[PDB]
Write a protein that binds this ligand. Structure first.
Ligand code: PIO
Ligand code: CLR
Ligand code: CLR
Ligand code: CLR
Ligand code: NAG
Lengths: 145, 804, 332, 158
């Protein structure tokens, strides 16, 4: 399955990174000799620059997603979801303050609580789509409450 | 296309009795019922992640009763409970309680006010309802849309979604029923047969909101692909496959810190692609300057744009700011009219003078306020019109022709020219005049106004120079024939005081002093207050002489010997030549070009989108009215007018309401211009009031208008930035995206154009100014792209001040 | 024409040279009396080196109320004529846009968190970064100087210690993780030291050691509860529970961990420390050289014991000079 | 004159006072030029008094920048929400501050009346009498924290 993001945005940056920032690496791979998909979350004690990232930004968080070929599991989309979760500020603060997997799970549950699902419709209209703005604002207020 | 209704098992407050009350309905758009008895505004159905996850979880092991031969709610409930017991969804001991709950009274919005309201309810093991144990969560849809049947197709069927909470259930259970024949049940209070039934029952569990579960089920049923699949469903597997396909094309929007509408509109083609994936398998398919090309199309478009707002154009004037603007524009139009009438009477041997110009201004202003599309424009005489009148008078004197009859024929040709232009929609060419030419013209006109204001004071100083000795016996009637002491210095003092008071009151309008209402009242009346203060100051100085306003004694022609009120087109004293009647077209062409450029550029300036004009402007109607009124007034021996830039800009700024810096709204109404025209016409009848108003106060007012007309011009801003360090430049698109030296070169090119226009003004061939002004448009459209990039030109020259 | 873009403290190299590499590779931990190297980056190229060098001055501040009389604030220029014994800065390598500056600290400097500030003439003071200054057992002029490198490693750098328990005739060595180079240990130790208001005496190892010992004994008295309860994971969790109050408390059966905690704090601050166990220790005598033991007719003790008892085992030893004492009392 | 001299030597930072050019050369040169004013009669004979009056007005309007009494007099004509973030506003009620400013205005009016009388040499005594007022009567009607916020030597929040 070709990526929607590639087909849409790729068929046609380091300066905006803050100097006092840290990097997050998300690794996704497929291994047929694994029973079930496995998630690996690592927060380093001190942020360090690894050879994996070719940028002068230290790495603090590491995401590792490995598993076999299974239906309804796109590991590219899984890595995109993990990166979107990490890019969110509330989950980032919770992960910085995380002391166990329970806090990360609670942060993920709160992230999914304020997630907004748009079902497919026959006639897409921009007015009905702009009716979604205050719902998204309310979900944002719930996320940052 | 079906109607979907969602009902939730709730309890009333007046009797504490549990029953079914509708919560939301789907007519392909979702409407919610709040706690006031009235439905909320329609909106698209939006679902939470947990609602869809739980819907999939309960649908995977759900109970389906397809092509069920039942026509009553009791039969459907009995069959559903029997299949629940057969599939081990519920225990046999729960069947009686569930049958009691499903057969309760189904109330609607009509009887909500008849009761004491509705409260969330949970079915208990016994016959008495209990309260929920989990914390209550108010619905987002209710809080958002509820705090404020004809479209149903006749050949449609209904879907009922029932959600309830029962603490005596092990796990949530989904019940899907498709009737063999659609039937009308007592649960739905509408004459639409029910084909599908959704039943969602279960205990209180985390991440399970049964209202959101019912909303998700109703949204799933309202979708056309799932509806077709459910109609064609023969087992739970097909429904599960349809649900999986529905979730495949579902789009999840994660929370973000900064919500931007551009990044949200980047989602449109993703949603289109998901829609194409959804309908790839289903049998169904997814569901003022313009040239119209019609004769007099622009006039009708302007009429239909503006005349519906005629009622608002009277009610919007009920504010003291409108009265203050009336007082401002009365002087700001009367004083230039008096000066131009006096100059024209001196230059044309009083053939046209102050009285005729005032009467023409009053009549044209009244008609333009009553019938125009942009009443904020001020109609009055202008300097180029005076130059053309002097040139035409000189030509007629050289050729021995009656000049007033020549003006009559010029107006007759002007009427034909404007009718031809409006008929072919000739005002659509104004769209080629970008911000470049508009700002250059506005800056040049403001500079001319300030220069004339200072030159009048210089002339006053020259007439009464500072000398050691003066002759105390100098005749005063009609004007002083010799220098007088303390005249020029007092005029300078009065002008400086007027300007200082106007600027201080304008700052006080935006200041943080006094209560806000009184502060705005004082700031709006700042110009009348300054004028009154300076007039009173000059009034108590009896000994010193200052020049005052002069108006004619009555409504009469300036020179009775030359002409009367009606001028014969065939000639007054001598027979008018035949050749001049046809030769008057070229002077009429020049007059039409001048009036067209002035009025259209003024309308462009006053109707910019950044000025918050939310009523619309009509170029064709205003041009037609102005030129027609000029042609009609030419017959009566009255000067033709035009929409002057300074007066109209000042009128728009006086009616502009400033928000908490940022323009909020503009008091667009027809009362202000009508009252200004009426007061101009009645200026003769109020001679004692106007006779005590010095010209120095009016000069200070003119200076204030000139310095305030430069606020909205980006050319003035870049001229100011020419004397600033690059780090002090404001965060604007034409600075952060364009190099400083490129912007300075652009400003220098504009300054060169301004200098060329100023040189053209200071020559006897000053009537060629409109042509040189027009020549800037080929410059902008040709030479600037040769030396500037497209992005640079879009940033520097933007119609609505946007970053490309 | 002399703007500052950034300032690289080079935490990794300096911490490896200052024997604080186990602390962090991101934060700058340096020891007094030893030079450390920083790199100063300019937004624009520097035209003439000498006038720009004359235009720049450096200021180091520590504490909430820095001052020169308290020796908590020092302003020094960037030149080769500066006192390398005192605060000084010299450019060792320079480019058009970067200066490699070697900064020295006095051997008797006040410890704690420092702020490094750069002043340009006719310009506001600019903060370059933060660093923590510690005692230097490697510096000969320092009061905590140790002659042997092996002794320095064992008594400061070794986080794997051994606390000896049991009896005199059967000594049971217990593995102990001091963890003085844990990330939060230095901050906790400095925050505990901040309770003392004599910040001018923080340059003296004797005063710091005495204040830390008194405060840690007070914390042991306040936090240790009367009687897995005896499962220990080192001195760092004990210090965290004593200071913050969150974690597994230590009970009276393991009250000997005060010496290990004190050794951890002293090693983290740069004072060489070791844990010493004395078997058959007479405690609670108040200097008296007599111990009274009471037994019944069955050779058993009826009561819980006297005030003065001979403990089965019982201390922290720190290495420093004693300037305020008569000569010859330097050492442990 | 001394306030104007201090303000002319005051260097303003990037709003905020940065430093003051404290030196003895300025006063010495001013005194020398005053002494030599007789010898430069042709230069001074062409200087109108109206320019000096405008200069005096500028000095008078610029001498009020550093006075908190003038600031509170201005705040008397402002809504409470427009008051700046200062210790004497965020810690003291608006009407208490207005009463304090009114007491100061009454004292100013008394001093002005004393000036406009033949016994104008008693002005220093009436000026001194404000100190017993501040040290006695104001604590009787204002709290210690209110007086510390309103009357602070270094503009500190108590
Ligand atoms: C002669 C006047 C009356 C004398 C009687 C003296 C008695 C007297 O004048 O008090 C009444 C009133 C107090 O009421 P209050 O302070 O609530 O009035 C606020 C004031 O009008 C602000 O200007 C408003 O903000 P903005 O402008 O819209 O942004 C604000 O509205 P909002 O935006 O917050 O919702 C208003 O609430 O006075 C004043 O306004 C304070 C300045 C008094 C200055 C001294 C009076 C000149
Ligand atoms: C542009 C508008 C005014 C129409 C064009 C003007 C021309 C075509 C028409 C309009 C009115 C006409 C005039 C009307 C009346 C007379 C009187 C008659 O004994 C001789 C011809 C004469 C003098 C006409 C000449 C042509 C004329 C001037
Ligand atoms: C002529 C008077 C009115 C104004 C003079 C100011 C103009 C000419 C000056 C002031 C600031 C100047 C710019 C400052 C900095 C740079 C960056 C350099 O790499 C190229 C030149 C450039 C882009 C300069 C061009 C000229 C400039 C725009
Ligand atoms: C006398 C002239 C110069 C200025 C008039 C403004 C003064 C008297 C007004 C303006 C704002 C007013 C205050 C506004 C709000 C309140 C809160 C109320 O619960 C008690 C009164 C109190 C505290 C008012 C006291 C009087 C007040 C301070
Ligand atoms: C009126 O016109 C006549 C010529 O017809 C002229 O002589 C006279 O001066 C004019 N009147 C005035 C006031 O100029």
């Amino acid at each position: 399955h070709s990526s929607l993001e590639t087909q849409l945005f790729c068929e046609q940056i380091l300066e905006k990174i803050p100097p006092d920032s840290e990097a997050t690496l998300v690794l996704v791979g497929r291994a047929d000799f694994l029973e079930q998909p496995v998630l690996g979350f690592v927060r380093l004690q001190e942020a360090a620059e690894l050879e994996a990232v070719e940028l002068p930004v230290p790495i603090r968080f590491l995401f590792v997603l490995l598993g076999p070929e299974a239906p309804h599991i796109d590991y590219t989309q899984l890595g995109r979801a993990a990166a979107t979760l990490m890019s969110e500020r509330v989950f980032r603060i919770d992960a910085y303050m995380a002391q166990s997997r329970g806090e990360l799970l609670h942060s993920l549950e709160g992230f999914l609580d304020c997630s907004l699902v748009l079902p497919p419709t026959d006639a897409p209209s921009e007015q009905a789509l702009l009716s979604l703005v205050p719902v998204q604002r309310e979900l944002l207020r719930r996320r940052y409450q | 296309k079906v109607y979907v209704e969602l009902q939730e098992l709730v309890m009333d407050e007046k009797n504490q009795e549990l029953r079914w009350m509708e919560a939301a309905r789907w007519v392909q758009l979702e409407e919610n019922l709040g706690e006031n008895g009235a439905w909320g505004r329609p909106h698209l159905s939006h679902l939470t992640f947990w609602s869809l996850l739980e819907l999939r979880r309960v649908f995977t092991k759900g109970t389906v009763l397809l092509d069920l031969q039942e026509t009553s709610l009791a039969g459907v409930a009995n069959q559903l409970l029997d299949r629940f017991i057969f599939e081990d969804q519920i225990r046999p001991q729960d069947r009686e309680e569930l049958l009691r709950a499903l057969l309760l009274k189904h109330s609607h919005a009509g009887e909500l006010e008849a009761l004491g309201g509705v409260k969330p309810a949970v079915l208990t093991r016994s016959g008495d309802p209990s309260q929920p144990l989990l914390p209550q969560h108010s619905s987002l849809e209710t809080q958002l849309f509820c705090e404020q049947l004809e479209k149903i197709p006749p050949d449609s069927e209904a879907t009922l979604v029932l959600v309830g909470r029962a603490d005596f259930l092990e796990q949530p259970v989904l019940g899907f029923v498709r009737l063999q024949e659609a039937a009308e049940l007592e649960a739905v209070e509408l004459p639409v047969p029910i084909r599908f039934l959704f039943v969602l029952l279960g205990p209180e569990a985390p991440h399970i909101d049964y209202t959101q579960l019912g909303r998700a089920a109703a949204t799933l049923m309202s979708e056309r692909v799932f509806r077709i699949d459910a109609y064609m469903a023969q087992s739970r597997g097909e429904l599960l496959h349809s649900l999986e396909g529905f979730l495949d094309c579902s789009l999840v929007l994660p929370p973000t810190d900064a919500p931007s509408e551009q990044a949200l509109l980047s989602l449109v083609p993703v949603q289109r692609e998901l829609l194409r994936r959804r309908y790839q398998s289903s049998p169904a398919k997814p569901d003022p300057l313009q040239q119209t090309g019609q004769l007099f199309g622009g006039l009708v478009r302007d009429i239909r744009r503006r005349y519906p707002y005629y009622l608002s154009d009277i009610t919007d004037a009920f504010s003291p700011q409108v009265l203050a603007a009336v007082i401002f524009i009365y002087f700001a139009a009367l004083s230039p009219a008096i000066t131009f009438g006096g100059l024209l009477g001196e230059k044309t041997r009083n053939q046209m003078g102050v009285s005729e110009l005032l009467i023409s201004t009053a009549v044209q202003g009244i008609l333009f306020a009553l019938l125009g599309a942009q009443p904020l424009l001020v109609v009055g005489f202008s300097g180029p019109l005076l130059v053309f009148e002097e040139a035409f008078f000189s030509f007629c004197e050289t050729n021995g022709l009656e000049y007033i009859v020549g003006r009559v024929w010029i107006g007759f040709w002007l009427i034909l020219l404007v009718v031809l232009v409006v008929a072919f929609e000739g005002s659509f060419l104004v769209r080629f005049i970008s911000r470049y030419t508009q700002e250059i013209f506005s800056f040049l006109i403001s500079l001319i106004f300030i220069y004339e204001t200072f030159s009048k004071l210089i002339k006053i100083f020259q007439d009464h120079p500072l000398q050691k000795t003066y002759n105390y016996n100098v005749l005063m009637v009609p004007k002083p024939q010799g220098p007088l002491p303390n005249t020029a210095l007092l005029s300078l003092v009065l002008m400086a005081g007027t300007f200082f008071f106007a600027m201080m009151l304008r700052k006080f309008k935006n200041s943080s002093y006094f209560p806000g209402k009184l502060r705005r009242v004082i700031g709006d009346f700042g110009v009348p207050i300054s004028i009154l203060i300076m007039v009173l100051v000059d009034f108590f100085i009896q000994d010193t002489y200052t020049q005052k306003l002069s108006v004619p004694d009555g409504f009469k022609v300036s020179n009775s010997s030359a002409r009367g009120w009606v001028i014969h087109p065939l000639g007054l004293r001598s027979e008018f030549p035949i050749w001049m009647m046809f030769a008057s077209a070229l002077p009429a062409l020049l007059v039409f070009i001048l009036i067209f450029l002035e009025s259209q550029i003024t309308t462009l300036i006053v109707s910019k989108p950044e000025r918050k004009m939310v009523k619309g402007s009509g170029f064709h109607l205003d041009l037609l009215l102005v030129v027609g009124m000029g042609g009609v007034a030419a017959l009566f021996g009255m000067p033709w007018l035009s929409a002057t830039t300074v007066r109209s800009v000042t009128h728009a700024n006086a009616l502009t309401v400033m928000g908490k810096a940022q323009i909020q709204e503009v008091k667009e109404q027809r009362i202000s211009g009508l009252l200004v025209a009426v007061l101009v016409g009645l200026s003769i009848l109020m001679e004692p009031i106007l006779s005590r108003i010095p010209l120095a106060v009016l000069f200070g007012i003119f200076l204030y208008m000139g310095v305030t007309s430069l606020s909205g011009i980006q050319l003035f801003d870049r001229i100011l930035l020419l004397f600033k360090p690059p780090k002090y430049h404001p965060d604007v698109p034409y600075v952060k995206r364009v190099k400083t030296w490129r912007m300075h070169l652009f400003t220098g090119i504009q300054i060169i154009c301004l200098a060329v226009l100023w040189v053209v003004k200071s020559t006897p061939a000053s009537l060629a100014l409109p042509f040189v002004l027009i020549l800037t448009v080929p410059l902008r459209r040709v030479l600037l792209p040769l030396i500037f990039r497209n992005v640079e030109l879009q940033c520097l020259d933007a119609d609505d001040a946007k970053a490309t | 024409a002399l703007g500052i873009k950034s300032c690289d403290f080079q935490a990794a190299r300096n911490n490896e040279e200052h024997h604080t590499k186990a602390l962090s590779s991101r934060r700058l931990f340096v020891r007094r009396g030893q030079p450390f190297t920083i790199i100063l980056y300019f937004r624009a190229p520097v035209r003439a080196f000498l006038p720009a060098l004359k235009k720049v001055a450096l200021t180091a501040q520590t504490g909430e109320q820095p001052s020169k009389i308290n020796r908590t604030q020092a302003t020094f220029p960037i030149s080769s004529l500066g006192d390398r014994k005192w605060w000084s800065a010299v450019v060792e390598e320079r480019d058009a846009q970067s200066w490699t500056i070697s900064v020295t600290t006095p051997a008797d400097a006040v410890i704690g968190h420092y702020s490094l500030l750069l002043q340009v003439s006719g310009r506001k003071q600019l903060l370059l970064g933060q660093f923590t200054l510690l005692f230097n057992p490697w510096n000969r002029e320092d009061a905590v100087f140790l002659k042997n490198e092996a002794q320095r490693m064992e008594y400061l750098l070794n986080q794997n210690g051994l606390i000896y328990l049991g009896t005199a005739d059967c000594i049971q060595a217990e593995s102990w993780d001091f963890g003085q180079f844990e990330g939060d240990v230095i901050d906790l130790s400095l925050r505990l030291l901040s309770k003392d208001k004599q910040v001018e005496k923080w340059s003296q190892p004797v005063h710091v050691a005495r204040v830390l010992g008194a405060l840690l004994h007070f914390l042991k008295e306040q936090r240790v509860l009367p009687t897995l309860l005896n499962k220990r994971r080192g001195s760092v969790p004990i210090l965290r529970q004593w200071l913050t109050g969150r974690g597994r408390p230590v009970y009276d059966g393991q009250a000997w961990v005060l010496a290990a905690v004190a050794c951890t704090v002293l090693r983290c601050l740069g004072i060489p420390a070791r844990v010493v166990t004395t078997f058959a220790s007479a405690q609670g005598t108040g200097g008296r050289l007599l111990i009274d033991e009471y037994y019944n007719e069955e050779g058993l003790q009826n009561g819980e014991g006297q005030r003065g008892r001979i403990w089965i085992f019982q201390s922290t030893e720190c290495w420093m000079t004693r300037p305020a004492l008569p000569q010859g009392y330097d050492g442990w």
